[PDB]
Amino acid sequence: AHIALELDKTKVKVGDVIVATVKAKNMTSMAGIQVNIKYDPEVLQAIDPATGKPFTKETLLVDPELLSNREYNPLLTAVNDINSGIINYASCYVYWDSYRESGVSESTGIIGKVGFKVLKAANTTVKLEETRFTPNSIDGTLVIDWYGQQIVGYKVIQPD
């Protein structure tokens, strides 16, 4: 069981597009997630990978695979801090009762994507990390189960 952050490109130059992708594997019972992706605003700017629209405070992660089934009522939210380089995205079903009794666990899959148009040639860091939004976290990740209790003991993998 782990949450991973994958970048499809590691070392490139200015004006290029880096798709960061938040992913979960074997997160059994997961009914909801909150992640924090910390970046440097001076070196990198947050954008939508499909159209190229910049990220504001209310902007969600692109193209969720997990926690998106309308049967179980997804409640998506984002309170990002672009000024201080934080993506704060939360997603969380309401109808847990049905989700657990269906006999399907949303364990492995994509949480969401975020584009990153590069501004400077100097090298920087991109990772899942604690903020003011996520106290009592595992490397800037909170995860609940279909009973509402916080899941603990999964690993959080960063990119290179």
Numbering used by the authors: 4 to 163
Article passage:
In ScaF Coh this residue is replaced by a Ser, and the β-flap is placed further away from the Coh-binding interface. This comparison indicates that the side chain of Phe136 in the ScaC2 Coh would clash with the side chain of Asn122 in ScaA Doc, strongly suggesting that the ScaA Doc is unable to bind Coh ScaC2 in this orientation. However, considering the inherent symmetry allowed by the interaction of two Doc helices to the Coh platform, it is possible that, if rotated by 180°, the ScaA Doc would be better positioned to bind ScaC2 Coh, a hypothesis that was further explored below. Thus, in order to probe the mechanism by which CipB XDoc binds to ScaF and ScaA XDoc recognises ScaC2, the crystal structures of ScaF XDoc in complex with ScaC2 Coh (CtCohScaC2-XDocScaA) and CipB XDoc bound to ScaF (CtCohScaF-XDocCipB) were solved. Strikingly, the data revealed that the two Docs bound ScaF and ScaC2 in different orientations. In contrast, ScaC2 Coh recognized ScaA XDoc, predominantly through helix 1 and CipB XDoc through helix 3. When the two complexes comprising ScaC2 Coh were overlaid (CtCohScaC2-XDocScaA and CtCohScaC2-XDocCipB), it was evident that the XDoc modules were in reverse orientations highlighted by the X-modules, which were positioned in opposite directions. Both ScaC2 Coh and the type-II Docs display a high degree of similarity when these protein modules were independently compared, which is reflected by the low r.m.s.d values (0.5 Å for 160 Cα atoms of the Coh alone and 1.1 Å for 54 Cα atoms of the Doc module). Although the nature of the hydrophobic interactions is almost indistinguishable, the ScaA Doc, which binds ScaC2 predominantly through helix 1, makes an extra hydrogen bond to Phe136 through Ser108. Steric constraints do not accommodate Asn158/Asn122 in binding ScaC2 and thus these residues are replaced by Gly125/Gly155 when binding to this Coh.
